[PDB]
Amino acid sequence: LKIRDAYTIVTCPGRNFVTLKIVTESGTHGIGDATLNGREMAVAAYLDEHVVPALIGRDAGRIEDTWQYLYRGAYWRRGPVTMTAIAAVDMALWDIKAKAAGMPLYQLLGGKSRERVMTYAHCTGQTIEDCLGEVARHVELGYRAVRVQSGVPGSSLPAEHVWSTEKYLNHAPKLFAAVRERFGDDLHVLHDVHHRLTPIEAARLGKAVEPYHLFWLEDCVPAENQESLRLIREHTTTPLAIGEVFNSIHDCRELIQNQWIDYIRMPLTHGGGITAMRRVADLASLYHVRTGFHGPTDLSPVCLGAAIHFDTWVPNFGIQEHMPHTDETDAVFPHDYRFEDGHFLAGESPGHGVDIDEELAAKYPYERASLPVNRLEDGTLWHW
């Protein structure tokens, strides 16, 4: 049916979320995540001031046409703000389509390819032992996979961290050796290098950690230049993951087609929604590349519900990141996905199974918060 109303909701139940809600003339509604961490109000404005008014009166069933209308119609294509706005609309429209079909989203997409969706948890410590304790506690929660991180020896506005590549490189292998010593070989172990290396440095790290058989080594190098992955891929057999900072298939087409990565990390709310990410996943599948959606707290339960539905259907699923939201957040975004024994189970309610309690949301006003920056020991502004 026709779109009668559309508007954003901004709320901060432990952290900032922006949500787009679309309401048809029949009263059926859908919501989509529009949260872009540290730049939230840019997306809110992109929506409120430019997209939202153009949605009014459109046929809500025309998902593809609306995607193209917003993507091409913007004239200025791609980008974090642009593609997050588009994702929010797309996610809301799929929510409405699934409701109209009377099916949970995963059925609409082609049905379930699996009975449960494997997640990984974050295990972080100041020391290696601190980290190991976190691994133990997540293993007990039923997690089959853990991302491990420990300190390297030696906020409203961005916090400023200090970084040393060489100290990190000499130290990191010790962490994975420790994990394997304590927990053995069955456990999937992931590591996020978080953009801090050059390609030949990452190649060195990849080789160094081969004996520990990592599930992936993530975001080795900044990849605006996709060729950056080539030296890494040519020098190590440690699996590679990338893409949480991407927003377009055009950010990763070459990475995938040249087989320079094993996992694509771009999530629904930043990658143009269901419509676009279906195309990204399908391109990946031609090259044995699997999905590994970014799943931090800064993607709302709306994205997570939609992602679990997507994960349930997509043939080339790899893994789903899990960073639990706060109780307050979960309360603001009632949902029917559930977590059991290290895995998500998709909801059965028509739609993506997530809603937003607007009354509750209104109790948590926006509070500005920025991501940190990283500087080298000489002060050079680096990659965080």
Place this chain on the structure above:
Amino acid sequence: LKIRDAYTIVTCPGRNFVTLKIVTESGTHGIGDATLNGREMAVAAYLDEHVVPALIGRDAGRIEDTWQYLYRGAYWRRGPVTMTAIAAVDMALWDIKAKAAGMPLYQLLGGKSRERVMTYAHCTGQTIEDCLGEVARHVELGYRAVRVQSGVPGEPADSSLPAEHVWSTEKYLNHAPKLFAAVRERFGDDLHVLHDVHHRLTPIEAARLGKAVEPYHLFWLEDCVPAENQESLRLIREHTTTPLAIGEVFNSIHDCRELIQNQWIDYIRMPLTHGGGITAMRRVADLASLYHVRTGFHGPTDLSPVCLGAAIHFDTWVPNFGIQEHMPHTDETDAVFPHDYRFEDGHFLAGESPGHGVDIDEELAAKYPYERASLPVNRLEDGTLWHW
């Protein structure tokens, strides 16, 4: 000197502009264009809510560090909203540095490479004849180059919400060569003639057109095909020697690195306000120069006099300058943005005032409230949402 204040100014003296002003503890100020046509408030919010607060107290002289701080620090990199915000800061900081150095921006950049900067004018008509009359009017004004567009038998942001146009590729391909033939027939060979295909063709269609217009020796054929996939240019380049221009919709060197390195284009069109400012555009221009590629900055009304003045300075220094688009701003716009660049005999002359030579009259700017205006969309005859 530290940044004491920073804030945006929104004004609509004939069309919308967003401007960033940065004021240092000494009271010296600098401005930068932040205008993103049809999405203006997204950049205003990006600046107001997330960038401006972080600028206070920063060393205004650290242009490079601030660029990297905003680019890398945002975590989410590239994009039209993102890079336009960064460009506004960068442009304002270069303005302040030039003022501090007591020289016009072109001097700071390495000095004058030319005595004047050639422009082209927009010439449009419903009929070929109408267009030819516009060509004549502009040659009399002293323009040495013209971009020609006419109707196909069978201020772009002109509506609050997007207008919907209808398009036929086949009709355009059959018609366009007739326009150029007529232009050459009437005006001869000396005149530079440009044409903007404006994203509508597939590569083999653009290859066909490029070949068809070879006899008319166009200065460039612009935006033949959407180029998110940079490989899109390859078939065109392999099939025609008509020169190619691309990039007004780009915001990053990573949007055009392969285009340039493979020699698939002759002119790069990404302008200062959308391509991350002077800092980023120096690097793009320099990459281009290795491959004989020249600058052809987008210069529509929707880039403010602030951008234009800085662009004219940039154009004056950059060795691999190609041409500067000129779409004249309204008298009201020129009044809100006093500037010392001048247009004479088809060319721009850079100003001599320290800074980029442009300022904003805030009192006058406040007299023209924001008015939403959207770019049109384009649909094929069957209703397919196409490229405008």
